[PDB]
Amino acid sequence: KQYDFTHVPKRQGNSIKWGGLKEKELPMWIAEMDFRIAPEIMTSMEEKLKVAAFGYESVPAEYYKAVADWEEIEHRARPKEDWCVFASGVVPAISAMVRQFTSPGDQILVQEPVYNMFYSVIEGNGRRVISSDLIYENSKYSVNWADLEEKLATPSVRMMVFCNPHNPIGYAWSEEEVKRIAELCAKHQVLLISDEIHGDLVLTDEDITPAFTVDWDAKNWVVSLISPSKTFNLAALHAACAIIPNPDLRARAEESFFLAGIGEPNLLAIPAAIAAYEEGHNWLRELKQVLRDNFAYAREFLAKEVPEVKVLDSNASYLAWVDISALGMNAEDFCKYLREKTGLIISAGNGYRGNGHEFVRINLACPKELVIDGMQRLKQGVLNLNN
Amino acid sequence: EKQYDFTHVPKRQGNSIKWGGLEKELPMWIAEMDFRIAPEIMTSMEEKLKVAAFGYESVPAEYYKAVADWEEIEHRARPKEDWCVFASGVVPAISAMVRQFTSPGDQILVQEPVYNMFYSVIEGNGRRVISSDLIYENSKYSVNWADLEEKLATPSVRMMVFCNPHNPIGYAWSEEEVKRIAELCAKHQVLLISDEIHGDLVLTDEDITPAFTVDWAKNWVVSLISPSKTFNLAALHAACAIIPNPDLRARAEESFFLAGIGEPNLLAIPAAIAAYEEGHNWLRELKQVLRDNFAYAREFLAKEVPEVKVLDSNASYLAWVDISALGMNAEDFCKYLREKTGLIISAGNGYRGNGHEFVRINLACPKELVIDGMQRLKQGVLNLNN
Numbered sequence: 001k002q003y004d005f006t007h008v009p010k011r012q013g014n015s016i017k018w019g020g021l022k023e024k025e026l027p028m029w030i031a032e033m034d035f036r037i038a039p040e041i042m043t044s045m046e047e048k049l050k051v052a053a054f055g056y057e058s059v060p061a062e063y064y065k066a067v068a069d070w071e072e073i074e075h076r077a078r079p080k081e082d083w084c085v086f087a088s089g090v091v092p093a094i095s096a097m098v099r100q101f102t103s104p105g106d107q108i109l110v111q112e113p114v115y116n117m118f119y120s121v122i123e124g125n126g127r128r129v130i131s132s133d134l135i136y137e138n139s140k141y142s143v144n145w146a147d148l149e150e151k152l153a154t155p156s157v158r159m160m161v162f163c164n165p166h167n168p169i170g171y172a173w174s175e176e177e178v179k180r181i182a183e184l185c186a187k188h189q190v191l192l193i194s195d196e197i198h199g200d201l202v203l204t205d206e207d208i209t210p211a212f213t214v215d216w217d218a219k220n221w222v223v224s225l226i227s228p229s230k231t232f233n234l235a236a237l238h239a240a241c242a243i244i245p246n247p248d249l250r251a252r253a254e255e256s257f258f259l260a261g262i263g264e265p266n267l268l269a270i271p272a273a274i275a276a277y278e279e280g281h282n283w284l285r286e287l288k289q290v291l292r293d294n295f296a297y298a299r300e301f302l303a304k305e306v307p308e309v310k311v312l313d314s315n316a317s318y319l320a321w322v323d324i325s326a327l328g329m330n331a332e333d334f335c336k337y338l339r340e341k342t343g344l345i346i347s348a349g350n351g352y353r354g355n356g357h358e359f360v361r362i363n364l365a366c367p368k369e370l371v372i373d374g375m376q377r378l379k380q381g382v383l384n385l386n387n
Numbered sequence: 388e389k390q391y392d393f394t395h396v397p398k399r400q401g402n403s404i405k406w407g408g409l410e411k412e413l414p415m416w417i418a419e420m421d422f423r424i425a426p427e428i429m430t431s432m433e434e435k436l437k438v439a440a441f442g443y444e445s446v447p448a449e450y451y452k453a454v455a456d457w458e459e460i461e462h463r464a465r466p467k468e469d470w471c472v473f474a475s476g477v478v479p480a481i482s483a484m485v486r487q488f489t490s491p492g493d494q495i496l497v498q499e500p501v502y503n504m505f506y507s508v509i510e511g512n513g514r515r516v517i518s519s520d521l522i523y524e525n526s527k528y529s530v531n532w533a534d535l536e537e538k539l540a541t542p543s544v545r546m547m548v549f550c551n552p553h554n555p556i557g558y559a560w561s562e563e564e565v566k567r568i569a570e571l572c573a574k575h576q577v578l579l580i581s582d583e584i585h586g587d588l589v590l591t592d593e594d595i596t597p598a599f600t601v602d603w604a605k606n607w608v609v610s611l612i613s614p615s616k617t618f619n620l621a622a623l624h625a626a627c628a629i630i631p632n633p634d635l636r637a638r639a640e641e642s643f644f645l646a647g648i649g650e651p652n653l654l655a656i657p658a659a660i661a662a663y664e665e666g667h668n669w670l671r672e673l674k675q676v677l678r679d680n681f682a683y684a685r686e687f688l689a690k691e692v693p694e695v696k697v698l699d700s701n702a703s704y705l706a707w708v709d710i711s712a713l714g715m716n717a718e719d720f721c722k723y724l725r726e727k728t729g730l731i732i733s734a735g736n737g738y739r740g741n742g743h744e745f746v747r748i749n750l751a752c753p754k755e756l757v758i759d760g761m762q763r764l765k766q767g768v769l770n771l772n773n
Contacts, residue, residue, distance in 0.1 A: 058404050062401075062402075099486075264624075270400075
């Protein structure tokens with residue numbers, strides 16, 4: 001390679017992933033990487049620091065142009081720069097738009113099993129989660145279009161929070177699927193909030209259909225949310241972008257961001273995100289490569305040594321969604337037992353709700369050597385359940 | 388000799404609010420400095436960048452110990468570390484507590500003229516500003532205690548956002564005033580939100596009285612501090628709420644997390660710790676530079692521009708200047724002044740109160756720029772009388 005995907009960065013003590021760990025514990029749960037970031041991003045941060053003064057920052061149009069250029073090169077989708085609004089984070093943007101575009105007690109539709117923070121921002125703000133569960137009929141998840149529409153048509157259902165690609169299952173919806181969802185939301189005057197934070201991480205050539213691509217009129221009912229944070233290992237950068245074609249909605253969300261305190265970039269957000277989106281193409285190409293190898297190793301080891309589990313077919317994200325149902329153990333119990341016996345820490349599916357009690361989520365955005373370790377620890381833990 | 392550099396203006400990138408989008412124009416409006424930051428802080432930032440991976444951060448105990456140590460050494464007031472909660476900014480913290488601790492339609496009290504952003508977070512959140520106006524007589528502002536108490540007594544008045552020290556008039560309240568304001572709030576079951584972001588910048592020995600030091604009324608107060616104004620780190624997005632009431636404190640923190648302002652960014656923790664552990668010497672030199680700038684500016688406006696009156700102040704690097712004798716609304720004056728001289732200062736109108744008669748001037752810049760701006764101000768006033 002041209003980039004380091006071998007050495008795990010040495011964090012300071014206050015890391016969520018690596019902080020507070022017992023000796024030899026291996027964290028493979030929270031969605032951040034154990035890879036150093038792109039040097040082109042690093043250079044922009046070191047460059048910014050040399051200003052040696054960190055007063056108030058505006059969002060320059062270069063930021064919106066970088067977002068537009070990135071979306072077109074990586075996704076063959078180009079937003080109008082005018083549609084774009086800076087937010088310091090995807091989840092806080094959802095939180096603010098929940099408060100601005102729905103009322104206390106309104107229902108907000110999700111597709112379970114879905115990312116836990118969806119529930120935290122809906123319920124934490126006093127809105128009610130309603131799910132049109134994704135059907136787990138094969139080794140696959142699919143949409144009940146009848147059930148989805150009738151829930152969308154419920155008057156108290158005011159918003160749909162859509163994970164595109166879908167986390168934790170790792171599925172980049174098809175162009176027909178995204179467009180059909182956005183048409184159904186428009187038809188029932190439901191706002192479609194499309195969380196596309198995993199959108200740069202499709203591992204197949206099947207690229208994402210960003211919600212803002214839907215044709216006009218329905219385009220007036222969508223928001224796309226992106227960030228460099230998952231793509232480039234920049235969770236603590238606090239840079240993100242809302243893409244809102246409807247300009248009334250856009251002006252209202254921009255004010256909601258300002259009032260939440262998430263509308264103003266910190267000292268590194270602008271130059272670092274611009275560098276990521278202008279210069280991070282080559283580092284991401286190699287990243288997906290390392291991800292595809294770790295998934296290939298992961299799937300083969302588990303097929304040959306832990307056939308009682310099943311790594312689901314996934315086409316996006318660095319998170320493996322593993323069916324542990326045949327182990328007969330609740331995911332959280334299994335994950336606890338795993339850490340206790342082997343020191344391997346992975347994400348229980350329970351918090352994603354849906355059928356997550358039968359699933360674990362494993363973070364493969366780490367050097368192959370840590371995948372080898374983690375896969376060996378999983379098997380050791382499965383074997384002792386039998387002894 | 389100064390150990391630090393207060394002579395060279397930082398070379399900013401294009402998206403600077405103060406210096407972006409400007410030939411020869413001189414911005415002295417928005418409250419950020421034109422000095423380099425303390426090298427002890429820069430060292431901490433460059434060390435954190437070597438991690439070269441910026442995943443999720445916790446708030447370490449060393450952050451709160453740094454805040455407590457700083458408050459004890461600079462202000463003779465050590466908060467309990469348990470009372471301390473990280474927030475990504477003072478104004479976002481105010482805004483979150485408006486939403487969490489008041490209802491839509493409740494009134495929130497301020498003392499006009501005061502920071503424009505207070506109105507934005509109150510009004511934009513669907514609460515109603517109520518002001519107990521400061522009384523302007525003798526070129527001094529005074530608190531109308533009777534009006535203050537009657538308004539705090541109003542059932543719909545549920546929160547007071549207090550600026551301590553007060554922006555834009557530059558006044559560090561006395562110990563008596565802070566405690567009285569806290570006791571009046573507590574008496575009426577009103578939350579006192581004490582924005583103490585200018586607290587380290589009292590340019591005299593006169594010190595600030597943090598709201599957290601009020602007698603065990605202490606259950607009704609929140610002190611908000613940050614290194615941002617003190618060390619020229621607005622965009623660092625590091626702040627700290629000091630909340631002695633443990634239940635109020637946990638609710639505020641929950642509100643910060645829900646809003647997206649409870650998690651530190653990649654530099655907030657090490658940089659704030661360095662500022663609060665190793666920034667004492669730099670701050671002491673800064674205050675000598677600021678006193679020198681104010682001495683020159685006050686003398687130069689008193690001797691050369693008798694048409695304006697700089698109000699007496701003891702805190703902040705901002706000067707509050709009565710321009711009423713020019714007979715011109717401050718918004719229009721500031722527009723004309725920019726057109727004729729290139730000097731950009733803050734019109735008083737947005738601070739409400741009697742701000743239509745005032746301008747605000749930021750003197751936290753090298754003395755060469757202070758000289759330039761003061762001379763341009765005279766140029767603009769002379770251009771009016773001619």
